[PDB]
């Protein structure tokens, strides 16, 4: 019963304008043996058809439309609840081209393993061919992809997370390049066999071939493992492209800040997961005359324009956010984005009237059905109602403070790049780099307590190539650029704590005051202290008007203590040794310079 190429249903009616794509699909279909092949078009009628089928399969339940229109809740197999690092590989030809932040395997060996897994993996399933565009369609030469998947769940979320379907397919023309992205949940079915709501496999791989720009995923239907745009393309493959083609693919939010004189500024900020970020991208300023709009909260792609400035575009089309922690008081604009519906919730809790709830959200519901389908009772049940890593998947276009430039293929000019992590000591609230190479060093040595892990540019699990070569790439772009047009680089810390354990700086909206200092520095309208680590404002350099806070706590937040920084040195030094032979001299230079300035 193994079926050949042109007898698999849906293959005879396949679009044929792009022969490379069609040959690839046929080769894949021959291998995985699905019941049928469907090319998705991203239309609303298709979206509803797939959602209905998801409801019928039990994968989705339809949420009360009075509270979220066109919205769904999906509960995963508990063994498949997140992105898995140790199962993620960069399979460059040479191990050194993956380097010490990456998991490597010989690509010939990986292909032998995965090709074996893929054989007959789609039996009894529909194989979807999902064309998609990264970034606005308006671009002349955008980065395109096609995800083949046996997961309908994946198709629906890809429609939200990328520009999916007919348009992207047309953009590929007859011979356009695209990233081949292959995915299976690894759960073949016999004829007539009852599926489960969330199929998956104990055997999981998430593999990237940087040279050919390919992504092979198997065994997981969840998140970044399966939505191949989200990190696999946006960061892993894209960063390798950017390396070769002279640009930057980064783990950054893009923020639009507008001053009281009505001038707009655009900032990119690299914070690791949970150092957010989502909150900064959706800032509501607490000082009069300042407004903020968002272009994105996770990925930024940046290229130098004609005028020598650095321009950023958000390559994604949707938000894929962590639900718990999100609430109306901390992040009302995120909540309003969600409130407009068209959202897929994964692993949150269900209320009695078909709303959704997760830990930290308002309401105090008395009874819930939790993320595993069990009864949950307020102030009694000892387990979390929602999975701690549960998700919302929501269109970007519903964000009430979406910047009008959000879908512009030309991008936005970046004035400032920010780096930050969770540091309870040592790092001050905000610091400005001395120049580009010092900013690269700051990015390169970014620490976050999540005992301090180094997470360079928030890219630790996401680099598509050797971390040292990546630092060198950052260095090279600044050396060959007009220094006057380069974004200024800043180093922030929202999480410094006093001895009594409280946050020295209140943060959230109040971070607008830090952003105001940053803008003034770019305009040369503010001063600061020259310290061994960079330019750090004193309390009197910050607008603290109307902020109910002890000025002493602010001074403490801004302090540069040499003893603390001397303890930081060997930690940094050991990280630079870990970076290995490809550590750029330029980075080591900045280490020595900082050490010398410290005395
Ligand atoms: N103390 C403090 N915590 C914050 C601040 N901004 C975000 N956090 C908290 O850090 C967590 C993660 O924030 P989030 O923006 O969702 O992070 P992301 O994953 O980088 O997008 C949430 O629990 C926030 O309440 C801040 O400015 N100050």
UniProtKB/Swiss-Prot annotation:
Its main location: cytoplasm. Its EC number is 4.1.1.32. It is an enzyme of class 4 (lyase). Binds 1 Mn(2+) ion per subunit. Keywords: Cytoplasm, Decarboxylase, Gluconeogenesis, GTP-binding, Lyase, Manganese, Metal-binding, Nucleotide-binding. Its cofactor is Mn(2+). One of its GO terms (cellular component) is cytosol. It comes from the Bacteria. GO terms for biological process: cellular response to glucose stimulus; gluconeogenesis; glycerol biosynthetic process from pyruvate; oxaloacetate metabolic process; propionate catabolic process; response to lipid; response to starvation. The active site is at residue 275. Belongs to the phosphoenolpyruvate carboxykinase [GTP] family. Involved in the gluconeogenesis, in growth on fatty acids and is important for initiation of infection in the macrophages. Catalyzes the GTP-dependent conversion of oxaloacetate (OAA) to phosphoenolpyruvate (PEP), the rate-limiting step in the metabolic pathway that produces glucose from lactate and other precursors derived from the citric acid cycle. Monomer. PANTHER family: PHOSPHOENOLPYRUVATE CARBOXYKINASE, PHOSPHOENOLPYRUVATE CARBOXYKINASE [GTP]-RELATED. This is Phosphoenolpyruvate carboxykinase [GTP]. It comes from Mycobacterium tuberculosis (strain ATCC 25177 / H37Ra).
